[PDB]
Amino acid sequence: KKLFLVFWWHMHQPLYREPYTGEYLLPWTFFHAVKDYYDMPAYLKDFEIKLNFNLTPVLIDQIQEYAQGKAKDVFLEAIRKDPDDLEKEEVEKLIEFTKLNYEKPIYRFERIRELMNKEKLNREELLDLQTLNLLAWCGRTLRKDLKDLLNKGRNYTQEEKEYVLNKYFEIIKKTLSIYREIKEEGKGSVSTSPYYHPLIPILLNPNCVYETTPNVKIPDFAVSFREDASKHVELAKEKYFEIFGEHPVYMWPPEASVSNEALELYYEKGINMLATDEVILKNSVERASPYLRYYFRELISVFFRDKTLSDLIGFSYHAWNAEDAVRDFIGRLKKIHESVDFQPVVFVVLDGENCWEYYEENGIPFLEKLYSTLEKEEWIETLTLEEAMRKEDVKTEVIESVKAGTWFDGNFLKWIGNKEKNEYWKILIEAKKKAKNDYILVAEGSDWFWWQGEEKAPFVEVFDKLFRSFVRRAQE
Numbered sequence: 001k002k003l004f005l006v007f008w009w010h011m012h013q014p015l016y017r018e019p020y021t022g023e024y025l026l027p028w029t030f031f032h033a034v035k036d037y038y039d040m041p042a043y044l045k046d047f048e049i050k051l052n053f054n055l056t057p058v059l060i061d062q063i064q065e066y067a068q069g070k071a072k073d074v075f076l077e078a079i080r081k082d083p084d085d086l087e088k089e090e091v092e093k094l095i096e097f098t099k100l101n102y103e104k105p106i107y108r109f110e111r112i113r114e115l116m117n118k119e120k121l122n123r124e125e126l127l128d129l130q131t132l133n134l135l136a137w138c139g140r141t142l143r144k145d146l147k148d149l150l151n152k153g154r155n156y157t158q159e160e161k162e163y164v165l166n167k168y169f170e171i172i173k174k175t176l177s178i179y180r181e182i183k184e185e186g187k188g189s190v191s192t193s194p195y196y197h198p199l200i201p202i203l204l205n206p207n208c209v210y211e212t213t214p215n216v217k218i219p220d221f222a223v224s225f226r227e228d229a230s231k232h233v234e235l236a237k238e239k240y241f242e243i244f245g246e247h248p249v250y251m252w253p254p255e256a257s258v259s260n261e262a263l264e265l266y267y268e269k270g271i272n273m274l275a276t277d278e279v280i281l282k283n284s285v286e287r288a289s290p291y292l293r294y295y296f297r298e299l300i301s302v303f304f305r306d307k308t309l310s311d312l313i314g315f316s317y318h319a320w321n322a323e324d325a326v327r328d329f330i331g332r333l334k335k336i337h338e339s340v341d342f343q344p345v346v347f348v349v350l351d352g353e354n355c356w357e358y359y360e361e362n363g364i365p366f367l368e369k370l371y372s373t374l375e376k377e378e379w380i381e382t383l384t385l386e387e388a389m390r391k392e393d394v395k396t397e398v399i400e401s402v403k404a405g406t407w408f409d410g411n412f413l414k415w416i417g418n419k420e421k422n423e424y425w426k427i428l429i430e431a432k433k434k435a436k437n438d439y440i441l442v443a444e445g446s447d448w449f450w451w452q453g454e455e456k457a458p459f460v461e462v463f464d465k466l467f468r469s470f471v472r473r474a475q476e
């Protein structure tokens with residue numbers, strides 16, 4: 001009797017490329033590509049387990065542009081420059097970026113602490129600020145190759161900075177190929193999402209927010225977004241076919257968000273399986289185990305992720321020692337294994353690139369120990385999405401209705417329902433009436449609405465500039 005364990009690591013970045021200047025206004029795609037997007041599937045080269053991945057199409061587009069040397073990244077241009085050529089504005093944003101990240105374990109260099117305590121910075125100190133910001137985002141693969149330079153910690157030269165940059169782009173250039181390779185080798189399945197990571201249930205029926213939050217105020221949805229919902233899915237299918245050679249049969253719904261209408265749409269578009277959140281299951285079915293494969297109306301398979309296990313990784317274990325965390329995780333899996341007489345399917349689903357920067361050494365001690373330990377347990381069988389979908393010795397249940405929501409509390413309050421977020425929807429509604437091109441789809445991405453109307457943080461205004469620029473461009 002085995003426990004079937006399914007990791008599904010979700011990778012996404014909204015579009016940082018401002019459409020009038022063509023500049024990437026934030027470097028986060030670059031930094032998560034060099035730190036996470038290659039290295040997360042590259043674990044499969046060293047560990048005999050299965051791991052699965054979601055790549056949003058808008059993320060794939062940006063990885064392609066960086067890989068081809070086409071991305072004009074303003075923050076990265078400031079890193080590349082000789083410090084004598086840095087504008088005051090660029091130094092300021094290098095310092096602000098450092099302060100934003102200063103407390104993360106991946107920024108644990110004594111030299112950073114020295115440079116932040118300094119009133120003015122000379123050329124050598126600026127070179128160190130530039131290069132340490134690069135090295136802070138070093139992924140697992142190059143932490144081996146660049147060991148000598150990482151241990152230096154200070155006194156970097158322009159030549160060493162450029163060496164690091166060249167290696168980082170070599171990683172980005174190999175990234176889509178490793179996803180293709182692990183898929184073809186049967187080491188993992190790869191899914192995608194509707195193109196720009198929108199909330200499909202809201203685009204199909206904005207009144208679905210009242211299934212969970214009856215008291216919320218929403219704007220007057222005087223335009224239909226239903227066709228746009230279909231387009232996000234269809235264009236995702238096309239992009240996925242380009243990279244992987246088939247239409248995708250697995251999708252991750254952005255924010256785990258489902259509704260009866262959204263599930264019907266995924267079925268109509270040929271998606272055979274998706275996953276969503278356990279809170280949605282508990283809101284929809286009184287007596288329900290998350291260890292079963294569910295069939296929504298016998299149209300499409302649904303797995304509900306194990307929220308506690310997913311949250312152990314996403315929220316707890318950064319604060320723990322790696323060995324303690326792995327022993328805890330295996331212990332919980334063993335209790336699950338001993339708790340049912342059938343073979344349970346245990347989905348572990350979370351962002352695949354955001355939690356590691358808060359772990360010691362970018363979470364590499366944790367993941368190496370986790371995967372090493374998993375591959376040794378006879379009673380754990382990790383599965384690809386494809387195996388989880390077709391596995392016969394699993395228990396199964398039909399469900400006829402779900403209560404619309406997301407993996408935030410089972411509701412939509414992070415993206416709609418307060419004055420500020422509603423203003424974004426009103427902007428989008430008005431723009432949609434006058435829309436002339438697919439930039440209106442870019443502006444439907446969930447990310448813009450998440451950041452809007454949130455307590456001020458460094459670089460928040462950049463998401464607002466992006467959103468409004470896409471809205472403007474949509475109408476021209």
Ligand SMILES: OC[C@H]1O[C@@H]2O[C@H]3[C@H](O)[C@@H](O)[C@@H](O[C@H]4[C@H](O)[C@@H](O)[C@@H](O[C@H]5[C@H](O)[C@@H](O)[C@@H](O[C@H]6[C@H](O)[C@@H](O)[C@@H](O[C@H]7[C@H](O)[C@@H](O)[C@@H](O[C@H]8[C@H](O)[C@@H](O)[C@@H](O[C@H]1[C@H](O)[C@H]2O)O[C@@H]8CO)O[C@@H]7CO)O[C@@H]6CO)O[C@@H]5CO)O[C@@H]4CO)O[C@@H]3CO
Pocket residue numbers: 010011012013014028032100101255314350351353354408414446447448450457458459460
């Ligand atoms: O939009 C840019 C963003 O896009 C991607 O992220 C999206 C992701 O793909 C979706 O799945 C979804 O993610 C949900 C997530 O899975 C849930 O876990 C939850 O996330 C909440 C966190 O759990 C919770 O801890 C908290 O996070 C707070 C941090 O703990 C706190 O440290 C601080 O974080 C600041 C960062 O330290 C700083 O670096 C900067 O963050 C930038 C990112 O580093 C950068 O990569 C990018 O983010 C991408 C992301 O990588 C994609 O995968 O831009 C960020 C902004 O510049 O600034 C942070 C804020 O100051 O504060 C955070 C927030 O309070 O809250 C989060 C969010 O509630 O919910 C997610 C939403 O359901 O959505 C995300 C976003 O669209």
